[PDB]
């Protein structure tokens, strides 16, 4: 909607009740700079090189979470306790680079329309859990105030690649098992 050469989110915050779940992140041009590990009080850079000479004081994200906890209490009453609507998330999986037999690659599970921001994304190969080396982003903000998140699974393409991205969310009656079509 607002056009610009660049946009920084220097303050992306979400908090929810009950459950006392939240996150604090910064973004630049739609990519995550860091999140603040609230309980450990520390900045976790999306790529480790980001924080080599630049610091972000984690207290900033703690302040914002504290303010959002307070703000939620007010607005929840003001709304006459209107609850969030659980959305059905949408998953797509695609490779980072062109698939070539034997050549190292990464499967990316892109999960969109996430709301509230609580989800489990996991990977299966040959319908068996694979957790080694899996990485996932923080919740990244959407203009419509839902979220998306990506999970990553390193793999070596093979003859019969059978990979699935499993998404569990309160907005789903059954878990979505999203198959990767090579």
């Amino acid at each position: 909607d607002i056009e610009a050469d660049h946009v920084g989110f220097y303050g992306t915050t979400v908090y929810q009740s009950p459950g006392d779940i939240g996150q604090y992140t910064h973004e630049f041009d739609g990519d995550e700079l860091f999140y603040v590990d609230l309980d450990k009080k520390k900045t976790v850079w999306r790529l480790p090189e980001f924080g080599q000479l630049i610091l972000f004081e984690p207290q900033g994200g703690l302040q914002c979470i504290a303010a959002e906890k307070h703000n939620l209490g007010i607005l929840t009453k003001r709304s006459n306790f209107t609850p969030a609507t659980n959305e059905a998330p949408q998953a797509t999986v695609f490779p980072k680079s062109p698939v070539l037999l034997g050549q190292p690659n990464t499967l990316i599970c892109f999960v969109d329309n996430i709301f509230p921001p609580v989800i489990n994304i996991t990977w299966l190969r040959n319908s068996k859990s694979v957790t080694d080396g899996v990485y996932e982003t923080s919740f990244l903000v959407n203009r419509d105030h839902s979220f998306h998140k990506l999970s990553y699974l390193t793999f070596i393409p093979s003859d019969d690649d059978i990979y699935d991205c499993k998404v569990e969310h309160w907005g789903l009656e059954e878990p979505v098992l999203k198959h990767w079509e090579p």
């Binding site: 220097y10 908090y15 630049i54 994200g61 990553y152």
Partner: protein
């Protein structure tokens, strides 16, 4: 170590006290800095959101907090009296500082070269992967002529790891003697990339 700064989350003048305890309730804050032509024009927008409804917003083009929906009517007056002057100042002390002192030495200098490969499946697919930043130009050539009709393209795909990819397709039919090339220009490349397919 220079420092990234943040946009402070303003609190309702509350005091609160109501309790909610399959129902959940969500609040969001978004502090957004828009930059065009360096820092020559900066626009700061802060958003206060209940569930998915933005109800209160500071917009530096507007100059103060305004209720976006009725839910924010009472909020705006309070935020203007408590936080207006320091929110205005954050256009310089947070948006401009972050761009000039932290993005200039990191995000804005980051360069990653696209990998370019051609596959069939007819449709020739030029896979342009793992590049940063987003600015790229990909063109298909069929024996020396830049193609127009018959070309399609994915959206620019954000990998989430500070790289992009785009797949650029050419509808075609193979014939014994023709050459096809995808040409890629990107700020990271010393020279444009050409990959031929026969």
């Amino acid at each position: 170590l220079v420092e990234r700064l943040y946009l402070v989350c303003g609190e309702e003048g509350a005091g609160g006290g109501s309790l909610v305890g399959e129902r959940h309730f969500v609040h969001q804050f978004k502090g957004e800095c828009y930059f065009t032509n360096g820092t020559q024009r900066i626009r700061l927008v802060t958003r206060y959101i209940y569930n998915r409804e933005e109800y209160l917003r500071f917009d530096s083009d507007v100059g103060e907090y305004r209720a976006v929906t009725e839910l924010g009517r009472h909020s705006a007056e309070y935020y203007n009296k408590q936080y207006l002057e320091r929110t205005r100042a954050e256009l310089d002390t947070a948006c401009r500082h972050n761009y000039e002192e932290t993005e200039v030495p990191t995000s804005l200098r980051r360069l990653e070269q696209p990998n370019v490969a051609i596959s069939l499946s007819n449709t020739l697919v030029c896979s342009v992967t793992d590049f940063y930043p987003a600015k790229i130009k990909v063109r298909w050539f069929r024996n020396g002529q830049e193609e127009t009709v018959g070309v399609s393209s994915t959206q620019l795909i954000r990998n989430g790891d500070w790289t992009f990819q785009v797949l650029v397709m050419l509808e075609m039919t193979p014939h014994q003697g023709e050459v096809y090339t995808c040409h890629v220009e990107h700020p990271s490349l010393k020279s444009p990339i050409t990959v031929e397919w026969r």
